[PDB]
PDB file of C-alpha atoms and ligand atoms in Angstrom:
ATOM      1  CA  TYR A  25     -42.176 -26.005 -41.488  1.00 23.69           C
ATOM      2  CA  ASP A  26     -43.256 -22.219 -42.065  1.00 22.66           C
ATOM      3  CA  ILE A  27     -40.247 -19.902 -41.049  1.00 22.78           C
ATOM      4  CA  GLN A  28     -42.316 -16.706 -41.552  1.00 24.87           C
ATOM      5  CA  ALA A  29     -45.699 -18.260 -39.598  1.00 24.01           C
ATOM      6  CA  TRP A  30     -44.613 -16.580 -36.446  1.00 26.12           C
ATOM      7  CA  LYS A  31     -45.738 -12.954 -37.619  1.00 25.16           C
ATOM      8  CA  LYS A  32     -49.163 -13.437 -38.202  1.00 23.48           C
ATOM      9  CA  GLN A  33     -49.420 -15.661 -35.004  1.00 23.97           C
ATOM     10  CA  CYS A  34     -47.817 -13.008 -32.949  1.00 24.99           C
ATOM     11  CA  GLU A  35     -50.169 -10.589 -34.558  1.00 23.31           C
ATOM     12  CA  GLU A  36     -53.462 -12.613 -33.437  1.00 22.69           C
ATOM     13  CA  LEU A  37     -51.803 -12.902 -29.636  1.00 23.32           C
ATOM     14  CA  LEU A  38     -51.402  -9.407 -29.783  1.00 21.92           C
ATOM     15  CA  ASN A  39     -55.049  -8.840 -30.838  1.00 24.63           C
ATOM     16  CA  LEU A  40     -56.146 -11.062 -28.060  1.00 22.73           C
ATOM     17  CA  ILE A  41     -54.023  -9.183 -25.705  1.00 20.27           C
ATOM     18  CA  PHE A  42     -55.593  -5.686 -26.667  1.00 23.46           C
ATOM     19  CA  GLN A  43     -59.070  -7.040 -26.190  1.00 25.90           C
ATOM     20  CA  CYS A  44     -57.877  -8.380 -22.633  1.00 26.21           C
ATOM     21  CA  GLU A  45     -59.014  -5.839 -20.115  1.00 29.71           C
ATOM     22  CA  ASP A  46     -55.576  -6.597 -18.106  1.00 29.13           C
ATOM     23  CA  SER A  47     -53.746  -4.871 -20.757  1.00 31.10           C
ATOM     24  CA  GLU A  48     -55.187  -1.539 -20.518  1.00 31.78           C
ATOM     25  CA  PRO A  49     -52.368  -0.083 -18.294  1.00 29.90           C
ATOM     26  CA  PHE A  50     -49.842  -1.429 -20.634  1.00 28.79           C
ATOM     27  CA  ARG A  51     -51.584  -0.411 -24.243  1.00 27.75           C
ATOM     28  CA  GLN A  52     -49.599   3.067 -24.534  1.00 25.18           C
ATOM     29  CA  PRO A  53     -46.414   4.344 -22.872  1.00 24.20           C
ATOM     30  CA  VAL A  54     -46.653   4.942 -19.308  1.00 22.51           C
ATOM     31  CA  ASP A  55     -47.580   8.612 -19.137  1.00 21.37           C
ATOM     32  CA  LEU A  56     -45.058  10.676 -17.407  1.00 21.48           C
ATOM     33  CA  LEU A  57     -47.465  13.170 -15.915  1.00 25.37           C
ATOM     34  CA  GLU A  58     -49.380  10.380 -14.171  1.00 28.85           C
ATOM     35  CA  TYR A  59     -46.146   8.965 -12.956  1.00 29.72           C
ATOM     36  CA  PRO A  60     -43.436  11.902 -12.615  1.00 28.13           C
ATOM     37  CA  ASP A  61     -40.370   9.243 -11.453  1.00 27.17           C
ATOM     38  CA  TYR A  62     -41.023   6.487 -13.705  1.00 24.54           C
ATOM     39  CA  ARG A  63     -37.936   7.271 -16.059  1.00 24.07           C
ATOM     40  CA  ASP A  64     -35.769   7.565 -12.893  1.00 23.32           C
ATOM     41  CA  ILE A  65     -36.819   3.711 -12.203  1.00 22.03           C
ATOM     42  CA  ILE A  66     -37.281   2.568 -15.909  1.00 19.22           C
ATOM     43  CA  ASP A  67     -34.462   2.839 -18.394  1.00 21.48           C
ATOM     44  CA  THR A  68     -36.422   1.245 -21.385  1.00 22.38           C
ATOM     45  CA  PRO A  69     -39.942   2.010 -21.386  1.00 22.93           C
ATOM     46  CA  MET A  70     -42.323  -0.543 -23.496  1.00 22.74           C
ATOM     47  CA  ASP A  71     -45.938  -1.101 -24.299  1.00 23.54           C
ATOM     48  CA  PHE A  72     -48.101  -3.228 -26.604  1.00 25.64           C
ATOM     49  CA  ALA A  73     -48.611  -0.241 -28.909  1.00 24.31           C
ATOM     50  CA  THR A  74     -44.853  -0.285 -29.504  1.00 23.33           C
ATOM     51  CA  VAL A  75     -44.566  -3.725 -29.751  1.00 23.60           C
ATOM     52  CA  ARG A  76     -47.653  -4.199 -32.361  1.00 25.07           C
ATOM     53  CA  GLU A  77     -46.316  -1.110 -34.522  1.00 25.17           C
ATOM     54  CA  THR A  78     -42.355  -2.770 -34.596  1.00 24.59           C
ATOM     55  CA  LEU A  79     -44.165  -5.908 -35.766  1.00 25.46           C
ATOM     56  CA  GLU A  80     -46.333  -4.192 -38.485  1.00 24.35           C
ATOM     57  CA  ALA A  81     -43.195  -1.789 -39.794  1.00 22.69           C
ATOM     58  CA  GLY A  82     -41.204  -5.395 -40.271  1.00 22.32           C
ATOM     59  CA  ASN A  83     -38.918  -4.608 -37.600  1.00 22.91           C
ATOM     60  CA  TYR A  84     -38.813  -7.953 -35.786  1.00 21.97           C
ATOM     61  CA  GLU A  85     -36.494 -10.558 -37.479  1.00 20.69           C
ATOM     62  CA  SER A  86     -37.876 -13.449 -35.115  1.00 18.60           C
ATOM     63  CA  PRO A  87     -40.402 -14.080 -32.465  1.00 15.35           C
ATOM     64  CA  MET A  88     -37.804 -14.217 -29.922  1.00 14.74           C
ATOM     65  CA  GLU A  89     -37.107 -10.481 -30.461  1.00 14.68           C
ATOM     66  CA  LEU A  90     -41.022  -9.722 -30.044  1.00 15.38           C
ATOM     67  CA  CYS A  91     -40.844 -11.833 -26.940  1.00 16.19           C
ATOM     68  CA  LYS A  92     -37.973  -9.926 -25.266  1.00 17.19           C
ATOM     69  CA  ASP A  93     -39.918  -6.564 -25.866  1.00 16.64           C
ATOM     70  CA  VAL A  94     -43.205  -7.994 -24.331  1.00 16.82           C
ATOM     71  CA  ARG A  95     -41.169  -9.631 -21.226  1.00 15.30           C
ATOM     72  CA  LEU A  96     -39.597  -5.778 -20.913  1.00 14.94           C
ATOM     73  CA  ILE A  97     -43.257  -4.391 -20.605  1.00 12.63           C
ATOM     74  CA  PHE A  98     -43.935  -7.018 -17.721  1.00 13.01           C
ATOM     75  CA  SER A  99     -40.410  -6.583 -15.967  1.00 11.74           C
ATOM     76  CA  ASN A 100     -40.835  -2.776 -16.192  1.00 10.60           C
ATOM     77  CA  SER A 101     -43.884  -3.255 -14.077  1.00  8.85           C
ATOM     78  CA  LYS A 102     -42.373  -5.480 -11.533  1.00 10.15           C
ATOM     79  CA  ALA A 103     -39.629  -2.649 -11.251  1.00 11.79           C
ATOM     80  CA  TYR A 104     -41.783   0.357 -10.806  1.00 12.32           C
ATOM     81  CA  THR A 105     -44.631  -1.483  -8.687  1.00 16.51           C
ATOM     82  CA  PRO A 106     -44.513  -0.156  -5.069  1.00 13.91           C
ATOM     83  CA  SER A 107     -45.739  -3.139  -3.885  1.00 14.66           C
ATOM     84  CA  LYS A 108     -46.082  -6.759  -5.289  1.00 13.78           C
ATOM     85  CA  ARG A 109     -50.116  -6.400  -4.334  1.00 11.27           C
ATOM     86  CA  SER A 110     -50.490  -3.540  -6.219  1.00 10.68           C
ATOM     87  CA  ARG A 111     -53.289  -3.506  -8.668  1.00 11.46           C
ATOM     88  CA  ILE A 112     -51.417  -2.626 -11.855  1.00 13.34           C
ATOM     89  CA  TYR A 113     -48.512  -5.125 -11.101  1.00 13.67           C
ATOM     90  CA  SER A 114     -51.293  -7.805 -10.454  1.00 14.17           C
ATOM     91  CA  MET A 115     -52.807  -7.149 -13.908  1.00 13.64           C
ATOM     92  CA  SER A 116     -49.210  -7.743 -15.276  1.00 15.83           C
ATOM     93  CA  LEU A 117     -48.797 -11.005 -13.715  1.00 15.15           C
ATOM     94  CA  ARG A 118     -52.062 -12.139 -15.304  1.00 16.58           C
ATOM     95  CA  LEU A 119     -51.308 -10.946 -18.539  1.00 14.31           C
ATOM     96  CA  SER A 120     -47.840 -12.403 -18.502  1.00 13.41           C
ATOM     97  CA  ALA A 121     -49.276 -15.957 -17.657  1.00 13.73           C
ATOM     98  CA  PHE A 122     -51.545 -15.554 -20.665  1.00 12.71           C
ATOM     99  CA  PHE A 123     -49.095 -14.393 -22.972  1.00 14.90           C
ATOM    100  CA  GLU A 124     -46.248 -17.051 -22.118  1.00 14.74           C
ATOM    101  CA  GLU A 125     -48.917 -19.968 -22.238  1.00 11.52           C
ATOM    102  CA  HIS A 126     -49.927 -18.821 -25.907  1.00  9.91           C
ATOM    103  CA  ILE A 127     -46.319 -17.566 -26.938  1.00 11.90           C
ATOM    104  CA  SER A 128     -44.710 -21.162 -26.086  1.00 14.07           C
ATOM    105  CA  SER A 129     -45.829 -22.829 -29.595  1.00  9.70           C
ATOM    106  CA  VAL A 130     -45.012 -19.968 -31.598  1.00  9.31           C
ATOM    107  CA  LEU A 131     -41.303 -20.021 -30.326  1.00  5.99           C
ATOM    108  CA  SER A 132     -41.146 -23.714 -30.678  1.00  7.26           C
ATOM    109  CA  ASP A 133     -42.744 -23.828 -34.143  1.00  6.19           C
ATOM    110  CA  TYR A 134     -40.320 -21.115 -35.439  1.00  8.59           C
ATOM    111  CA  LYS A 135     -37.233 -22.691 -33.953  1.00  7.66           C
ATOM    112  CA  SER A 136     -38.080 -26.109 -35.153  1.00  7.42           C
ATOM    113  CA  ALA A 137     -38.774 -24.412 -38.749  1.00  4.43           C
ATOM    114  CA  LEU A 138     -35.551 -22.554 -38.428  1.00  5.88           C
ATOM    115  CA  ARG A 139     -33.513 -26.039 -37.662  1.00  5.70           C
ATOM    116  CA  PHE A 140     -35.423 -27.682 -40.874  1.00  4.08           C
ATOM    117  CA  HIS A 141     -34.439 -25.097 -43.129  1.00  2.37           C
ATOM    118  CA  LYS A 142     -30.540 -25.500 -41.838  1.00  2.00           C
ATOM    119  CA  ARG A 143     -30.883 -29.468 -41.863  1.00  2.00           C
TER     120      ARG A 143
HETATM  121  C1  UWD B   1     -48.056   0.494 -16.348  1.00  4.49           C
HETATM  122  N1  UWD B   1     -48.088   1.823 -15.711  1.00  4.49           N
HETATM  123  C2  UWD B   1     -46.959   1.999 -14.859  1.00  4.49           C
HETATM  124  C3  UWD B   1     -46.951   0.901 -13.761  1.00  4.49           C
HETATM  125  N2  UWD B   1     -46.393  -0.152 -13.835  1.00  4.49           N
HETATM  126  N3  UWD B   1     -46.191  -0.911 -12.665  1.00  4.49           N
HETATM  127  C4  UWD B   1     -47.173   0.038 -12.013  1.00  4.49           C
HETATM  128  C5  UWD B   1     -47.423  -0.258 -10.743  1.00  4.49           C
HETATM  129  C6  UWD B   1     -48.184   0.481  -9.963  1.00  4.49           C
HETATM  130  C7  UWD B   1     -48.745   1.637 -10.715  1.00  4.49           C
HETATM  131  C8  UWD B   1     -48.311   1.701 -11.861  1.00  4.49           C
HETATM  132  N4  UWD B   1     -47.504   1.024 -12.493  1.00  4.49           N
END
């Protein structure tokens, strides 16, 4: 029933993601000195510190918006990878699976709380 509960749930999931070794390449914006062509391939950079800061600033209205930005971290890695077997892309796939496994109930609970609010 709680239409605000998603925010703390997302903070806790981000905390788990930050603790996970697989998130290290994604914790901060991609370094252009390390990957000079990055912005030729990627129009909208995204990283987990930006997601956490947007959430903490009160700049997400719903968990769907947070999801869209987290999914953009993963689609950027898929678009930038030179190979489906690259180390960083393989880390993104595991992290995506972990994220999707945990965000599912957050989205479901939010959408059902919102439907209850508008009943
Ligand atoms: C997150 N760092 C940029 C980036 N995103 N996908 C890949 C794949 C290989 C190398 C670097 N990559």
